Design an enzyme around this catalytic site. Structure first.
Site, mmCIF file in Angstrom:
data_model
loop_
_atom_site.group_PDB
_atom_site.id
_atom_site.type_symbol
_atom_site.label_atom_id
_atom_site.label_comp_id
_atom_site.label_asym_id
_atom_site.label_seq_id
_atom_site.Cartn_x
_atom_site.Cartn_y
_atom_site.Cartn_z
ATOM 1 N N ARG A 153 1.074 -1.421 -0.193
ATOM 2 C CA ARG A 153 -0.054 0.043 -0.249
ATOM 3 C C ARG A 153 0.464 1.311 0.135
ATOM 4 O O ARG A 153 0.523 2.456 -0.272
ATOM 5 C CB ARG A 153 -0.597 0.380 1.191
ATOM 6 C CG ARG A 153 -2.150 0.541 1.047
ATOM 7 C CD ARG A 153 -2.927 0.988 2.082
ATOM 8 N NE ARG A 153 -3.046 -0.093 2.611
ATOM 9 C CZ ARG A 153 -3.351 -0.367 4.033
ATOM 10 N NH1 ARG A 153 -3.006 -0.108 5.001
ATOM 11 N NH2 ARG A 153 -3.354 -1.714 4.294
ATOM 12 N N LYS B 200 -4.406 11.186 -18.562
ATOM 13 C CA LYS B 200 -4.240 11.756 -19.964
ATOM 14 C C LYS B 200 -2.989 12.117 -20.540
ATOM 15 O O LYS B 200 -2.271 10.677 -21.359
ATOM 16 C CB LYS B 200 -4.735 13.201 -19.611
ATOM 17 C CG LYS B 200 -6.186 13.535 -19.327
ATOM 18 C CD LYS B 200 -6.726 12.937 -18.447
ATOM 19 C CE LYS B 200 -8.346 13.500 -18.801
ATOM 20 N NZ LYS B 200 -8.636 12.228 -18.487
HETATM 21 C C1 LIG Z 1 -8.917 -7.356 8.148
HETATM 22 C C2 LIG Z 1 -8.505 -5.961 7.238
HETATM 23 N N1 LIG Z 1 -9.140 -5.938 6.266
HETATM 24 C C3 LIG Z 1 -8.835 -4.450 5.385
HETATM 25 C C4 LIG Z 1 -7.283 -4.673 5.440
HETATM 26 C C5 LIG Z 1 -6.233 -3.899 4.212
HETATM 27 O O1 LIG Z 1 -6.795 -4.744 3.141
HETATM 28 P P1 LIG Z 1 -5.295 -3.789 1.788
HETATM 29 O O2 LIG Z 1 -5.379 -4.687 0.892
HETATM 30 O O3 LIG Z 1 -3.752 -4.193 2.251
HETATM 31 O O4 LIG Z 1 -5.507 -2.142 1.821
HETATM 32 C C6 LIG Z 1 -6.141 -5.889 5.634
HETATM 33 C C7 LIG Z 1 -4.740 -6.042 5.233
HETATM 34 N N2 LIG Z 1 -3.650 -6.513 6.561
HETATM 35 C C8 LIG Z 1 -2.325 -6.206 6.704
HETATM 36 C C9 LIG Z 1 -1.751 -7.421 7.820
HETATM 37 O O5 LIG Z 1 -3.104 -7.548 8.329
HETATM 38 O O6 LIG Z 1 -0.661 -7.566 8.093
HETATM 39 C C10 LIG Z 1 -7.348 -6.935 6.503
HETATM 40 O O7 LIG Z 1 -5.991 -7.851 7.341
HETATM 41 C C1 LIG Z 2 -9.269 18.602 -15.654
HETATM 42 C C2 LIG Z 2 -9.178 17.053 -15.504
HETATM 43 N N1 LIG Z 2 -9.113 17.468 -14.176
HETATM 44 C C3 LIG Z 2 -9.204 15.899 -13.488
HETATM 45 C C4 LIG Z 2 -9.639 15.035 -14.773
HETATM 46 C C5 LIG Z 2 -10.163 13.456 -13.372
HETATM 47 O O1 LIG Z 2 -9.457 12.209 -14.187
HETATM 48 P P1 LIG Z 2 -9.794 11.113 -14.449
HETATM 49 O O2 LIG Z 2 -8.297 10.005 -14.092
HETATM 50 O O3 LIG Z 2 -10.611 10.920 -15.502
HETATM 51 O O4 LIG Z 2 -10.435 10.288 -12.818
HETATM 52 C C6 LIG Z 2 -9.592 15.056 -15.819
HETATM 53 C C7 LIG Z 2 -10.948 14.259 -16.027
HETATM 54 N N2 LIG Z 2 -12.018 14.103 -17.686
HETATM 55 C C8 LIG Z 2 -12.739 13.366 -18.470
HETATM 56 C C9 LIG Z 2 -12.539 15.237 -19.405
HETATM 57 O O5 LIG Z 2 -12.429 16.195 -18.965
HETATM 58 O O6 LIG Z 2 -12.682 14.687 -20.208
HETATM 59 C C10 LIG Z 2 -9.921 16.324 -16.243
HETATM 60 O O7 LIG Z 2 -10.252 16.618 -17.368
#
Ligand SMILES: Cc1ncc(COP(=O)(O)O)c(CNCC(=O)O)c1O
Ligand SMILES: Cc1ncc(COP(=O)(O)O)c(CNCC(=O)O)c1O
Ligand SMILES: Cc1ncc(COP(=O)(O)O)c(CNCC(=O)O)c1O
Ligand SMILES: Cc1ncc(COP(=O)(O)O)c(CNCC(=O)O)c1O
Lengths: 391, 391, 391, 391
Positions: free
Chosen positions: D54, D206
């Site tokens: 993460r 983009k």
């Molecule tokens: C029970 C439980 N719930 C959420 C997470 C977070 O998931 P992630 O994809 O890592 O953001 C976990 C993560 N755990 C790491 C660990 O236990 O060592 C989790 O266990």
């Molecule tokens: C100027 C500007 N800022 C943020 C975003 C969002 O990014 P995303 O990866 O799509 O969540 C955009 C998104 N644009 C789509 C569009 O203009 O058609 C953006 O233009």
């Protein structure tokens, strides 16, 4: 300890750099910091130093190391698919004037490579019945260079007596190159090199990948044959991409649990089919009475999920459609070794046409099944409904 | 309209399904809903119907369509890398007793395939100077089946007079298969099939991928040669993975704007080197005076960024290290066609050893450069610092 | 039928287009052929029509369909990881003035989101012991909006009495949103939405991915809560990339066979530890005597392979290194749910500090184990060697 | 030197391990060899030591390094998309009682985050005209914590006078957090952190990705704001997958040569539209006379390819279909920054509805164009044919 080996094979920090799995290193160019580093990489270009992407990156080296451990080999060559591994492994060991002796139950593309490519290049191919055993000695010619095994055989599932075949070949032609297409066993349910076979070839496409979404071939050779395999396959440009290599290593990690389920389920289906009034024969290496079953029991450490059976009649074209078109869980597709169940049909004359110099010994329609990871009672109900459509 | 074609080639809704780029369809198994659908797929297994992953998925079909459009061919076969494309395309058209005529400036692995694989299969290889032009007719034998061109040549960059070579071949042996390794032109700066060449082969690894992180070969054939190429490459199991096919299609979309920069920068570097007191010769197809430059100017629509030059002396081993080990921007690596600049050195006798039946005409150390996308004045400063280390 | 459901969930022709698995459709831009199509896509931008990559492509739709089927929900929102799913699912249902009631065994990052992010936004958080059952009713405030469960708890593995908690919440605050972090059950060993919980959240990172090489969070909501979850998570830009969505769907296909092995192996290890002289306590939901085991037995359909145990002493720094540094098969890493076995140590005072308003009732070092797919006798030998290093 | 920097940013041996590009390290679990190594990684879990997926793997670290170099920041936070980057970067710096001051030309999802998420959490939002310049001082309230810029603005393309705005903010509220959505400049055509802005946010979706097939957001902060951005975004679980991080780094390597072509072609189209009888106004930052052009000329080092223009009437739905449905090269899709050209229509009253507390000063339909890499004369002919369908 096979499960422990499968979880750990090839997973060393030089490849993983801290993650659980190897890094994915995508490359053609690999950079040399100095002239002396380039010279060292050149000397070690086939010995695990980064040199050029056609030889491999860290990701390939990790897979190669895993395959050598699991199959007990000196080296593992990689290929774009199983058919490429078969064709190029045979090609690596022949020259014009040589002869190949191949089981008549070999995978059809392997046969077609021999009759349509090798023949053009001055290499002849002869054939043997899969149960020939020690009598193969009588088929070895002065120019026989390669003996090509496939156990169980494609489609019809006959299991060779490998100890008898190998002993006979070694008596007459101890120098011969003995190869096996070991795809059905995933290279791990039958340890081919321990039986005196020189090279174990697999379509890693099947159980090693395990999910029907990658293609890759492997060939693991003993020390006597490795350099020739490696260098001649490299001269043909044979390689696999880094990502598929990663996915093959990843597949190893669940291969044990998967295979045990395919074994349990396919054996149950085979036992049920063997009692069924609409079934003439079941071709499953693990089922008593199947061709070469006693060699499977002696020489293998398990079964996979692919097998076939023969119906009590020859289906008409209308019956074939009524049967095959209306399954709910089994699908029609080529390949196998994935998580899902598959079904295909062949008429006896179709099989006879791919049994060179031989006939078949059945007259009903043959059905090939791959038994996946679905609940077996659901699969049995699907088969039962199919039987009701043709009774 | 090349830039428009590059942006749009192969990008049809049946492959993209609503996205800008093709979907990535990873598969071995491809599912048939009915027996009749399976029969239709079988009849069209080489004509763009989903049949089996070894033939391809939607992702491959999209790339193949793009390559056929851009190179003007009937079909495009895919391979795991450029060297596999060369080896298997030649192999597809030869049999025991045939003769191959190959430029002596061919890529070394292509030569090694001929001398170390083909020779033991009963296929002989003869050689020609890249500037032979019409006099190639005198080298064509009754058994000459393949004439293999590479323009510009590997390392030394000589440009063939393709119109003169092709016309001479067609006078004597019109049925011969004329092939070219068209990697330097990325298949688009020289439209080989419009010149009467039968098959245009590329290491798509280079400029098509464009980022040094994928390997793939392509071979685009005319209608006369396509079926044999397709089916024989398939019998050898040649394919590429779907993800690399996707990345090659993706590379096409910036190929025009990349090549223009490689051309502009490399020509500026070549012009500067040609005036430099420590440079004896510059081998750049676009530079006046270079071997075959007049054919490049007449027959190509642009240049890429790979070329070579010869120093005014033969570097000692100490000078080679002082020169090569201390660049700040150029790196040592094999391959080329990416976004970064690369440098390698070869002594004259090393090149002579890969010029069969020929000698070289220089005595200084040869330097091969790939000019990437860095600012050209920065690259010039790096080369100038290199010159100061060996003056 | 769970194994059949896992093999087939989400695998419809509209997503697979002929392959076994969904296509991988990588996209921000999704193309509208006409204004009419654009209007239809806009109206259905949260209803499975291609509109914009932030909403998803075919690959996401396939996973979402699978998750809704398997967890019995009305919709499935996707997130970059489990912690993002937890934080954004809670955030989607609170506003200033609200109160959250969370188990004191919740994953530490979940607690930190409440105490570090929510608290400065006007949202308070209170805590309950995991075995409170029906007495939770006295902790519900007029402004309690969310009741957050995690069963088994993180690290210490206590199992809630979910029927007693839900009934008490519904008697006092019927309109509250009841959520559960259902990662340990992989969403399938405990069918949370059948127990009256509103939203089941998972770190699909763990058992769904199954190979320690992807990160992704999911939240499956009932019909009452789906629209608010979907639209407020979208306002925070929460999504996952198409390739990780593909790999999560792919993980589902082996989840059943993996979980059965993790259960069998981890219970065997727990039983051995529970009679071991160097172990004070074993925390495994499936082990009789563990906290909440009677609820696990009644409400779950199986177990996974994560659990903990308490040593007979608190290891010093030298002892902890002698123990942990010298394992041969268990590795030290965070996360779990993969094919490999993992080990981590937590000192009691560290756990107390992440048990808000509560004390711990043990004094030895706690060891958390993930039991992977290795041979269980090999894992037991590794643990036994560990015990010998600290005896 | 920008092209050299773009080729080399983040490409250090510790990440590339011999290849040209970073390795792709996919991981949740990262393995600690010893307790000592785990302690070090814990202390440095936000300082570039492998700790947990993460936080990132080598692949993320390489991208983060590149972004910090190119935008001149102290750190770079990664998000699943641009909208997540905006929403979470704002959220990271507000608490109940704070006020946000945002340009009324902000991207609509950014506005909706403020009005629909922030408002119910006790954070208010006010608005300002993009040309307000130094008069923004009058709008800063004692509780104003964040001032949010977007230059050029969404859809209508107005360019702020950033020096005037920043100086006014620092005179009245020196501690405020000034942020900019710098997507149009790809972070490199406007070096926001050199103008005294605290955080530069991009939809790397983009131009950085550049091929319309990945989504990712970035936020690069100065030293003053980095720790709060990093830790609060992490508490919300914000991350991107390793493969999209790799593809973002890969996009940098062609960003320069792409942007130069987008600038050249889009300005040519804008100049043509500016003299066209069916066009009322052209909104292109590089076009003299466009709103804020003089600030673009002074403060930017180039232009990208996105711009808009206003027709001489408000088109009916029937005219919109006749116009938009029949282009040959321009396609309708959201997003931009890729290799292909896109077209969308916006009615004036729809734009007015996303201009909070303000009106539009035009009454014709607004057409937003993304000018891709196709041949510009082909694009002009496509636009001309469109004009003829509505004349
Ligand atoms: C029970 C439980 N719930 C959420 C997470 C977070 O998931 P992630 O994809 O890592 O953001 C976990 C993560 N755990 C790491 C660990 O236990 O060592 C989790 O266990
Ligand atoms: C100027 C500007 N800022 C943020 C975003 C969002 O990014 P995303 O990866 O799509 O969540 C955009 C998104 N644009 C789509 C569009 O203009 O058609 C953006 O233009
Ligand atoms: C036994 C056996 N050996 C090689 C192959 C070819 O592998 P591929 O990766 O497909 O090139 C197979 C292929 N089988 C397809 C089928 O049986 O339907 C094989 O079975
Ligand atoms: C001209 C030419 N033709 C084929 C290849 C081989 O392609 P690959 O994808 O590497 O198998 C190349 C390769 N070049 C490496 C080098 O020149 O350093 C080539 O140049």
């Amino acid at each position: 300890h096979l499960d422990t080996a499968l979880v750990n094979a090839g997973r060393r920090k030089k490849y993983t750099q801290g993650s659980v799995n190897s890094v994915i290193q995508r490359a053609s160019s690999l950079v040399f910091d100095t002239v002396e580093a380039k010279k060292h990489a050149t000397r070690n270009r086939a010995k695990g130093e980064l040199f050029y992407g056609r030889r491999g990156t860290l990701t390939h080296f990790s897979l190669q190391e895993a395959m050598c451990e699991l199959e007990g080999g000196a080296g593992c060559a990689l290929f774009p698919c199983g058919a490429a591994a078969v064709a190029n492994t045979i090609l690596a060991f022949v020259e014009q004037g040589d002869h190949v002796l191949m089981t008549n139950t070999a995978y059809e593309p392997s046969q077609d490579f021999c009759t349509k490519i090798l023949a053009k290049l001055g290499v002849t191919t002869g054939w043997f019945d899969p149960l020939i055993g020690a009598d193969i000695a009588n088929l070895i010619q002065p120019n026989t260079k390669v003996v090509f095994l496939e156990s169980p055989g494609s489609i019809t599932m006959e299991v060779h007596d490998v100890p008898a075949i190998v002993a006979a070949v070694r008596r007459v032609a101890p120098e011969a190159i003995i190869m096996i297409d070991n795809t059905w066993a995933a290279g791990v349910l039958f340890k081919a090199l321990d039986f005196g076979i020189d090279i174990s070839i697999q379509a890693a496409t099947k159980y090693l990948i395990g999910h029907s979404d990658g293609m890759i071939g492997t060939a693991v050779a003993n020390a006597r044959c490795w350099e020739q395999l490696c260098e001649n396959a490299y001269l043909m440009g044979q390689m696999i991409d880094a990502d598929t290599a990663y996915m093959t290593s990843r597949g190893l990690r669940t291969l044990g649990v998967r295979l045990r389920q395919h074994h349990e389920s396919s054996l149950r289906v085979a036992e049920w089919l063997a009692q069924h009034p609409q079934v003439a024969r079941v071709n499953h290496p693990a089922l008593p009475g199947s061709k070469g079953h006693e060699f499977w029991k002696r020489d293998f450490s398990g079964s996979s999920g692919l097998f076939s059976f023969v119906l009590n009649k020859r289906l008409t074209d209308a019956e074939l459609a009524a049967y095959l078109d209306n399954f709910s869980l089994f699908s029609m597709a080529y390949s196998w070794g994935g998580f899902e169940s598959l079904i295909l049909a062949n008429q006896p004359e179709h099989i006879a046409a791919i049994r060179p110099e031989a006939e078949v010994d059945f007259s009903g329609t043959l059905i090939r099944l791959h038994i996946g990871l679905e609940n077996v009672d659901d699969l049995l109900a699907d088969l039962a409904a199919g039987f009701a459509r043709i009774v």
